[PDB]
């Protein structure tokens, strides 16, 4: 029942997705890593793209949790569709 | 070539808190001298093997590892080259790269750490 936009993810689901990115740090996983980073850029549509992960702003937490919060707050304030609510 | 085993040589350069920053500027950044000290007379299977062990040594050196975000620290702890900033990326090339400064003249020149620079993809071109 496949997910195509960020509205198809609950917050915890998208959080886990971002954690997966952090964990795919082995050279043997490069292909999956780049593909999940692309998908992340497509789903978020955030203008910093991969920098949210790898070059975060300094005044929020450098963690997948801090990334999701910045994405939620950003999508909210530009009137864009959010995460699937609750579950 | 990159694919032939050999032994690393040379000293590198002293480096500070802005090392990684310099990698994104003209000619990139040197191999840090304290990393060269760790790699200097070791035998490598190929350049790929060198790169992997380079990044792993960068991870173990707190004053270099602190220059990267947490996701990139995970990359380098595993010997995987770290993701560059979007502005430093060139299409398909997303990671910091290692490149040679001078034409390779002699045997084992692939592993001369006097002549290797760490660069963003954007600065690899030269």
Numbering used by the authors:
A (entry chain C): 2 to 88
B (entry chain B): 4 to 129
Provide text from the study:
The colE proteins are nonspecific DNases, which are produced by Escherichia coli to eliminate neighboring bacteria. In the colE/Im system, comprising four homologous pairs (colEwt2/Imwt2, colEwt7/Imwt7, colEwt8/Imwt8, and colEwt9/Imwt9), each cognate pair forms an ultrahigh affinity complex (KD < 10−13 M), whereas the non-cognate pairs show non-protective affinities (KD > 10−10 M). Our results demonstrate that the design of substantially different backbone conformations, orientations, and sequences at the binding site generates dozens of new interaction pairs from a single starting one.
To verify the atomic accuracy of the design procedure, we determined the structures of two designed pairs by X-ray crystallography: colEdes3/Imdes3 with >3 orders of magnitude pairwise specificity relative to the wild-type colEwt2/Imwt2 and colEdes7/Imdes7 with low Im specificity. In both structures, the conserved hotspot region formed as predicted. To test whether cognate affinity could be improved, we focused on colEdes3/Imdes3, which exhibited KD = 73 nM and at least three orders of magnitude pairwise specificity relative to colEwt2/Imwt2. The designed rigid-body orientation and side-chain conformations at the interface were also atomically accurate, except two polar side chains (Asn31 and Gln34) that reoriented due to a water molecule that was not modeled by Rosetta. Apart from this difference, the polar interaction network in this complex formed with remarkably high accuracy compared to the designed one. Due to backbone preorganization, the designed polar interactions can only form accurately in the cognate pairs as seen in the crystallographic analysis of the high-specificity pair colEdes3/Imdes3.
